[PDB]
Every structure is written in structure tokens, then in C-alpha cells.
Amino acid sequence: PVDRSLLKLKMVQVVFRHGARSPLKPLPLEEQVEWNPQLLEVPPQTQFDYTVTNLAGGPKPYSPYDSQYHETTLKGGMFAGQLTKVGMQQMFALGERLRKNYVEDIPFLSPTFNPQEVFIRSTNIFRNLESTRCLLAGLFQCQKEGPIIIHTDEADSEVLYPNYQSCWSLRQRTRGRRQTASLQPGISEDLKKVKDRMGIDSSDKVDFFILLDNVAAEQAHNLPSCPMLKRFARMIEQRAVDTSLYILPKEDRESLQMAVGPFLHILESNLLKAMDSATAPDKIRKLYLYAAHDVTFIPLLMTLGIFDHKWPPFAVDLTMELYQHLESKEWFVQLYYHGKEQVPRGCPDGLCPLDMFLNAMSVYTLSPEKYHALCSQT
């Protein structure tokens, strides 16, 4: 048994999903809920100025995703996929929770944003950059000692989600299952049933991802959803998860490696920086922030053996704390998901000795050189 009073907090990594937003695509029904631009009013307490650069960096890369979303105008006038004031407030509250843990309860982080203590990375999509702003606003109460810089990568090299367009081997392994996923036993019958009851045309192309997208977005904003959409909300969520897992199952190790392995390699590398005491204390940070996606969380959670079979909700976070025992000099990792203490695969306890944790992750970790080899057929 370890006495936690001799544990000293060294490093924190937070991976989070953006807050509540408008749907990527609306449902194909004559009667749709309105997405009103009034939902985009910025809460004053989240006002924080930042700039975005590439990883170098370097100018903010072009975002194909932002362009794609602006091609879709929802009933009411909002664009698809935009963070709302509801989402901004969720991200702010996550920020204030972090402040409680890492600023107030122990003096780990400065009360004001210090560029040298914090590394910030996001995918290059407006809802993630804005969520990052709101998280920081809550964590630092809109106070900074220096400019906030968010790093983002070119879409073609991005590792913060499974990248199908850039990784040829991943695309090839999953293509067959992706084709047939909605035709699988029990998924297909449920899908047919929900579409029938909702009066959605048999010809319309709709899967559980689209249904879940809309019910989660509508529910988070308390919009007047179709009564049948509400009746099936839980089943819809379950089947969206089943679809995802059929395509990228826990038993397919190599697909998991290519999907999340490079991101895990990043998280591992951060932990390892603690093993070198003298080397580059300049490069090391106290806090690493990554704005990632629900499609990142699912495989990520599975590789850590903590997946709960729920769709990762708006503003969810995965938090990794690294401690060193002051007497023993042993290193320990603690993992939390959505505020809840977790016990990862291959770990005896919630407080996991660093060496055992690293061994567990190493099953799925993918170095950049290996990953690069697989991204190409030739």
C-alpha cells in the first residue's frame, strides 16, 4: 500500500473532445429542428485571445474540414458542425475543474497562463480551437503572462484522429467491414426499425452515426426532437458504438496500432521525458493539452482497456497524471475518464506503477517511422 502524501505531481496530460455543437448533417425529415445563430453568442467569461500556428510553426494550415462544414446550412441559419454557447460553457467548466485540481488543491500550475508550463495541440477545425479557448479561459480565468499559441497540423499528416486518407494500410484493412457495417446482424434490423418508426424514406442514406449525431446535439440543446428519436436514443447510441467496433474491433491489433498508435506514442513520449532529469528541462512542460475527436477516444479507450461502450460525450476528457514517490523514487500513473478514476488493462490498481503502464501501452504504440512505412503501399 502506497501513502499518497509522499506522491509529488510531475506531469499532466489532458485529451478532450470539444463541447456541444450543431450536427454535421441534419436528418432527412420534412420536420427539422431549428439551429438558430443566437446559439453562437459568446459567453463573456470565455473571451480569451489566442493565435493558431502549424506544428513548426508557422502559418495556420488550411482546414478542409471547416470548408466542408460551411457547405451545409441548417434550418434556422447555423452552419453544420459549429460549437455553441452550450458547448463553450461545458468547456469552460472543464477548465474550472482543472483549475481546482491543478491550481487550487495543489500549486502545480501558475494561476495565470504561462506559455512555458503548457503545450497546446488541437486538430485544425474551428470547434476544437474554440473549445480549447474556452477550456483555457476556465483554467486560467482569462489571465495570461504571454500569448496563447495553439499548434495544429496539416490534415494529411494529422495523428489526433485515425487518418484514413493518409494511411493506406489502415484504409485497406477496414474497407470491407466499413462497407458492410450497417448490414450486420442486429444492427441492420434495428436501423430498419428506427427508420420505419421515424418515417424516414427507405431510400435515404442514414446510419447510426447520423442518428446519434442529431439526437446528441438536439438533446444537449433541449431542442424539440422527434418523439421517436427520443424513444430510441439509447439504442441508437448502442448501435453507433456497435457499428464503430465492427469496423475497428478490439481483436484487430494492427488496425488499432495504425488508428491510435502514433497518438499513444506522443503520450508515451511525454511520460518518458520525465526519465531524463537533466536533459532539456526547457522542452518539458507541466501540462499537455490535446483537442481530439470522439473517433479518437473510442480506439484510445479500448487500447487502454477502459472502454465503457458509450459514445464519448461532448466535452469529455481523459486525464493522465504522473507522480514520483518522494521517498521511494518510484513513478506512478493515474488515469481519469470523464472525472472518474480508471484502472487500465495490465494495471493492478488505480495508481499504476509507470513501468507496468508503459508495458501495457506498448502493445498499441506506433513509432513515426513504422507508421510512415504503412501509410504507403509502395
**Alpha-helix runs per DSSP H in the chain:** 64-70, 85-99, 126-140, 168-180, 187-198, 208-220, 227-231, 233-247, 253-272, 294-303, 354-362, 368-374
* 54 CB neighbour count, 10 Å cutoff: 15
Q: Which residues of 97-131 are buried (b: 16+ CB within 10 A; e: fewer)?
A: bbbebbbeeeebbbeebbeeebbbbbbbbbbbbbb
294 catalytically annotated: yes
Q: Which of 68, 56, 57 is nearest to 125 (CA)?
A: 68
Q: How far apart are CA 308 and CA 60, in angstroms?
A: 36
* Polymer length in residues for the chain: 378
Q: How far apart are CA 236 and CA 231, in angstroms?
A: 10
* 319 CB neighbour count, 10 Å cutoff: 21
Packed helices 168-180 and 253-272: angle between N→C axes, nearest 10 degrees: 130
Reported as half-sphere exposure (CB side, CA atoms, 13 A), residue 328 has a value of 15
Pairing label, strands 50-54, 331-337: unpaired
Q: How far apart are CA 375 and CA 168, in angstroms?
A: 5
**Catalytic hit among 153, 213, 294, 317:** 294
**Catalytic hit among 18, 151, 221, 265:** 18
CB contact at 8 A, 220 and 33: no
207 catalytically annotated: no
Report the catalytic residues.
Answer: 18, 294
